[PDB]
Amino acid sequence: ALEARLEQASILKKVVDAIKDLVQDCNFDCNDSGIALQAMDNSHVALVSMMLKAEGFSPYRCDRNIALGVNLTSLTKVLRAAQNEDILTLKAEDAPDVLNLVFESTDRISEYDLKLMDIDQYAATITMPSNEFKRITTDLMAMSESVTIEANKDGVKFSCQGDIGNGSVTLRQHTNVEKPNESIEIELSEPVSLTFSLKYLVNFCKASALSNTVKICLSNEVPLLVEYSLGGSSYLRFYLAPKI
Amino acid sequence: ALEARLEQASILKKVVDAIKDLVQDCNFDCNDSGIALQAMDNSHVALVSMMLKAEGFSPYRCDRNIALGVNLTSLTKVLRAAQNEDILTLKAEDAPDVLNLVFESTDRISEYDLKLMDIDQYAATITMPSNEFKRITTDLMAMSESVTIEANKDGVKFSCQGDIGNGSVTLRQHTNVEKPNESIEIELSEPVSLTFSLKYLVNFCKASALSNTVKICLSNEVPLLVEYSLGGSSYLRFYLAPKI
Amino acid sequence: ALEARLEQASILKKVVDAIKDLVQDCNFDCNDSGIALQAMDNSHVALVSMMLKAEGFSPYRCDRNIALGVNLTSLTKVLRAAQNEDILTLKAEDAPDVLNLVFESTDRISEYDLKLMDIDQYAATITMPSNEFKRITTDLMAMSESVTIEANKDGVKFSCQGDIGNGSVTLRQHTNVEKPNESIEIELSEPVSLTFSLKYLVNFCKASALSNTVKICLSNEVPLLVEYSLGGSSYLRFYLAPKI
């Protein structure tokens, strides 16, 4: 019914790793389109939204719509047995009791049957290196619980205040021709100034292994979106409402 | 009386490291033949058997038979002062109160006198990379307390079952010409299927630093033997009875 | 009033790192000459003495004498936001309430205002690799609380005794032409034999990141001095009285 092959297991390892600290139990929703996940975190503050599109697999088949009820601690114990370069295959039958995972290298075949659970179901956009976003959130987290994010045409300022004093980091808008991976770009219709939990943003930044660039999407009316491309139109997205 | 020189200290560092988690107090039995160790682990389940043959030293002299009563926590504190490439020399007199260790580089000489203690004294054979054996035992240990090992002419299957579901890893028999280090070989007189404690096998796999290949020797009547070559006919061997 | 620019932040990161385990609250005393620190450790046993000379900066300006009352846990939280190769600038006004730190790369500017506190104010010399000094102190610390340091024209012996037995490490005097970094040199007027706390010497050795050579200055009348050059005549010095 479901049969989905990744040429490399890396992507699914990294996704689950990026998410297991926020989400324990979730559903992997599989259809014609690919494999999606929508989950609030354990404290019901951050939204997690993932899509692996069918074109990300080679091949991808999902006859019928299948929700795979999965504990991500359980799932991590199985994916650790997968090497990054292992061919990974997911197999499932209709209303499955288990999900079947196979890892193929060196004439080695690993096969796991994971027991499934019953689980109930912008004003400014910043494109920058994900490592840089991770380093800033991590650094300011040592100083403050909260960070203020100011965007305008010219650059982005992350600012905070704590016991020991206060800190800012300012990244000016910059197209890097020789190394585009390093560019700071700011598509923006209106300057914005919004305050957020660093704890959640640092959790979001665990996903910097997936993409060397991150999209930070700011609105005065809807949650912050932090977004990592998984290839083509596949994505891992995090939503966090500003502190009001 | 005893005087034994290793051109490099690496081997003795790695041996003790491979063993200290199972054995605290043991005897290093020295004679004409070299330096042996036979010890049950602390829970009296696994047998440890080591031999460093006299030809492993340059030179080796042992006039009289000498049992060196040694705590391997104590001994580790001294061997950590030895660099891998240091010339290492053991010296002992008859019925010794101490063992004398010297480490020589860079015009540096380290000398230790360790206080000795009074210490009371196959159907199928698998040759494979030790790292691979370590990765499989480690991975299945996250899933299960026990692993079933099935050998036949064609390959080896390690299987297990736990809370989250069950897992298998299958390695087919394969002679690797370009990189022989990677080959899976199965000298076998009779297919065998035996269940063992993963906890002990993972402990045994600490020794994968000593040899890039490991020998897994299965019998329906005698304990499993896990075996690592230390050069020539020198060996570190582990014995573990199947779960019945 | 104070404005001091380091071409690289590395040195100030390493200094604070080398010191934070001994000293919590200290004064950075700034004048015409540069930036000094004198502090007993928390147990009032070891003296810490640092000088960054004005020529170490590019540029250095200190109109008026300024004591910067600083918690080094607080200061570490801010310096972690500085990359090793970041241009670092310290700014302060007269009787300052805060110290202003700026880190400049990649069109990135980080700026921190740290709240300041109200803080109340040889017979033989050994030149050797600092890594070697660190490896010996660390190794003997596993064995003993105390180390005896014997120097003479010919070499240096570090010796100790504990529960498990005793250990020595002997480094002979040696000029290394091809790699001078590795030489052992002993300017000496009188052989000396002195016993010291390993715990403190291992703390001192955290500073081996600053200099690949260390100066060990022994007197029968005044404290041991352990000394690391920070470039030119800039220094980090540690003083420790022998066990009597």
To which residue do tokens 């004409």 refer? B32
Taking the CA of residue A176 and the nearest CA in chain B, the distance in Å comes to 42
Best CA proximity match to B124, nearest among B228, B47, B239, B220 = B220
Give the integer Cα–Cα distance in Å for B108 and B152. 53
Preferred mutation among C140, C144, C169 to probe B, highest tally of B CBs within 10 A: C169
d(CA A22, CA A25): 10
User: Burial, C189: exposed, middle or buried (Cβ in 10 Å; 0-12, 13-18, 19+)?
Assistant: exposed
Which residues of chain B have a CB within 8 Å of the CB of A115?
163-165
User: Contact, B5 vs B89, CB < 8 A?
Assistant: yes
Task: Give the amino acid at B18.
Answer: A
Cβ pair A142:C77 closer than 8 A: yes
B77: contact with C, CB 8 A cutoff: yes
Q: Could you tell me the end-to-end alpha-carbon distance of chain B, in angstroms, rounded to an integer?
A: 46
Element (H, E) at C200: helix C198-204
Interface contact C116, partner A, CB < 8 A: no
In terms of phi and psi (left: phi > 0; alpha: psi -120 to 50; beta: otherwise), the region of A231 is left
Apex A126 CA angle, A124 and A130, nearest 5: 155
Residue A175 CA to its chain's centroid (Å):
25
Helix ranges restricted to H, chain A: 10-19, 72-79, 130-141, 198-204
User: DSSP code of A180?
Assistant: G
Which residues in A lie closer than 8 A to residue C81 (C-beta atoms)? 139-140, 142-143, 167, 169
* Type of residue numbered C214: V
Local structure of residue A243 (DSSP, 8 states): P
Report how far residue A228's alpha carbon sits from residue B26's, in angstroms, rounded to the nearest whole number: 55
Contact C71 A170 (CB under 8 A): no
- Which of A171, A199, A230, A215 lies closest to A46, judged by CA? A199
CA B239/CA B227 separation, integer angstroms? 9
B/e letters for A147-183, b = 16+ CB within 10 Å, e = fewer, are bbbbbeeebbbbbbbbebbbbbbbbebeeeeeeeebb
Q: Which two tokens stand for residue B52?
A: 């460093």
Q: Is C24's Cβ below 8 Å from some Cβ in A? A: no
Burial of A94 (0-12, 13-18, 19+ CB in 10 A): exposed
- Flag if C71 and A164 touch (Cβ within 8 Å): yes
Q: Which residues of B touch C166 (CB under 8 A)?
A: 112-113
Residues of C in contact with A184 (CB under 8 A): 107
Rounded Cα distance, A69 and A28, in Å: 7
CA nearest neighbour of C228 among C80, C48, C4: C48
3-state DSSP assignment of residue A167: strand
Which member of C98, C107, C110 has the closest CB to residue A172?
C107
Yes or no, beta carbons of B166 and A80 under 8 Å apart:
no
Contact A110 B165 (CB under 8 A): no
Would you kindly state where each structural domain of chain A is located, as residue ranges? 1-244
Whether A65 contacts A27, CB under 8 Å: no
Q: How many CB atoms lie within 10 A of CB B179?
A: 9
A155 CB contacts (<8 Å, ≥6 apart)? A170, A171, A172, A173, A184, A186, C107
- Shortest distance, CA A238 to any CA of chain C (angstroms): 25
Give all strands (DSSP E) within A54-198, no chain letters: 60-62, 66-71, 87-92, 98-104, 108-115, 124-129, 146-152, 155-161, 165-172, 185-188, 192-197
Three-state SS at A215? strand
Both tokens assigned to B241: 């009875």
Distance from CA of A200 to the nearest CA of B (A): 28
Q: Which of C145, C164, C186 to mutate to test the interface with B (most CBs of B within 10 A)?
A: C164
d(CA A5, CA B90): 57
Q: Is A24 on the interface with B (CB under 8 A)?
A: no
Q: In what order do the strands lie in the sheet with C213-218?
A: C66-71, C25-31, C34-40, C47-53, C235-240, C224-229, C213-218, C124-129, C185-188
Which partners does chain C have (≥3 C-beta pairs < 8 Å)? A, B
Show Cβ contacts of residue B178 under 8 Å, excluding neighbours closer than 6 positions. none
How far apart are alpha carbons B233 and B211 in whole angstroms?
13
Interface test with A, best of B132, B136, B164, B184 (most A CBs within 10 A): B164
The rounded distance, in Å, linking the Cα atoms of C208 and B188 is 56
- Does C117 reach chain A within 8 Å, measured CB to CB? no
For residue A2, the one-letter residue type is L
Distance from CA of A41 to the nearest CA of B (A): 22
Question: What resolution, expressed in A, was reported for this entry?
Answer: 2.3
What span, in angstroms and rounded, lies between the C-alpha atoms of B89 and B101?
Answer: 6
Distance CA A159, CA A168 (A): 4
Round to whole Å and give the CA distance between C204 and A41: 45
Q: Collect all residues with Cβ–Cβ distance below 8 Å to C168 and sequence separation of at least 6.
A: B110, B111, B112, C157, C158, C159, C160
Give the minimum alpha-carbon distance from C242 to chain B in angstroms, rounded to a whole number: 23
A185 vs C44: CA distance, rounded Å: 53
Ramachandran sector of residue C107 (left: φ over 0; alpha: ψ -120 to 50; beta: rest): left
Tell if the CB–CB gap between C80 and A169 is shorter than 8 Å. no
Give, for A237, the enclosing helix (H) or strand (E): strand A235-240
Q: If you measure CA to CA, which chain B residue comes closest to C158? A: B110
Q: Is B220:B235 a contact under the CB 8 Å cutoff?
A: no
For residue A45, the Cα-to-chain-centroid distance in whole angstroms is 16
Q: Which residues, in sequence order, are CB contacts of B156 under 8 Å at separation 6+?
A: B126, B128, B149, B150, B170, B171, B184, B186, B216
One-character DSSP codes across C40-72: E-TTS--EEEEEEEGGGSSSEEESS-EEEEEEH
Give the SS3 label for residue A38. strand
CA dihedral C133, C134, C138, C144 (to 10 degrees): 30
Give the β-pairing of A213-218 and B108-115. Answer: unpaired
Q: How far is A218 from chain C (nearest CA, A)?
A: 20
DSSP chain B: -EEEEES-SHHHHHHHHHHTTT-SEEEEEEETTEEEEEEE-TTS--EEEEEEEGGGSSSEEESS-EEEEEEHHHHHHHHTTS-TTSEEEEEE-SS-SEEEEEEE---EEEEEEEEP-------EEEEEEHHHHHHHHHHHHTT-SEEEEEEETTEEEEEEE-SSEEEEEEEE-B--SS-GGG-BEEEESS-EEEEEEHHHHHHHGGGGGT-SEEEEEE-SSS-EEEEEE-STT-EEEEEEPPP-
Beta bridge partners of C243: none
Q: Which residues contact A31 (CB under 8 A, 6 or more apart)?
A: A62, A65, A66
- Round to whole Å and give the CA distance between C42 and C63: 32
- Rounded to the nearest angstrom, the minimum Cα separation between A121 and chain B is 21
Q: What is the distance in angstroms between the CA of the first residue and the CA of the last residue of chain A?
A: 46
What stretches of chain C adopt beta strand conformation (E)? 2-6, 25-31, 34-40, 47-53, 60-62, 66-71, 87-92, 98-104, 108-115, 124-129, 146-152, 155-161, 165-172, 185-188, 192-197, 213-218, 224-229, 235-240
In sequence order, what are the beta bridge partners of B71?
B25
Q: How many residue pairs bridge chain A and chain B with CB atoms within 8 Å of each other? A: 54
Dihedral sign for Cα C122, C123, C127, C131, please: negative
Which DSSP string do the residues of C87-120 spell out, in sequence order?
A: EEEEEE-SS-SEEEEEEE---EEEEEEEEP----
Å between C171 CA and nearest CA of chain B: 5
Residues C112, A171: C-beta atoms closer than 8 Å: no
From A147's Cα to the closest Cα of chain B, the distance in A is 38
Task: Please tell me if residue C143 touches chain B, with a CB cutoff of 8 Å.
Answer: yes
- Helix, strand, coil shares of chain A, percent, nearest 5, are 20, 45, 35
CB-facing half-sphere around the CA of A139: CA atoms within 13 A: 23
**Residue B113 contacts C, CB cutoff 8 Å:** yes
Q: Does C78 touch chain A (CB under 8 A)?
A: yes
Q: Which of C140, C143, C172 sits opposite B107 (nearest CB)?
A: C172
Of A143, A168, A184, the CB nearest to C107: A184
Q: Which experimental approach was used here?
A: X-ray
Of C106, C111, C112, the CB nearest to A182: C106
Pairing of β C124-129 and β A185-188: unpaired
CA distance C158 to B79: 17
Structure-token pair, residue B195:
């269940």
Please answer yes or no on whether A77 and B172 come within 8 Å at the CB atom.
no
- Pairwise CA distance, residues A206 & C36, whole Å: 40
| Nearest-angstrom CA–CA distance, A169 and A176 | 19
Helix C72-79 with C10-19: angle, nearest 10 deg: 150
Q: What's the CA gap between B11 and C59, in Å, rounded? A: 54
Write the Ramachandran bin of C128: left for phi over 0, alpha for psi from -120 to 50, otherwise beta: beta
- Which three-class secondary structure state does DSSP give residue C221? coil
Size of interface B-C (CB pairs under 8 A): 54
Check whether the bond before A59 is cis (ω within 30° of 0): yes
Residue of A nearest to B182 (CA): A106
| Tokens found for residue A82 | 């997968």
B13: tokens are 């560092």
Taking a C-beta distance cutoff of 8 angstroms, is the pair C144, C162 a contact? yes
Bridge partner residues of B150 (DSSP): B157, B193
B168 touches A: beta carbon within 8 Å = yes
Please, what's the largest Cα pairwise distance for chain C? Answer: 58
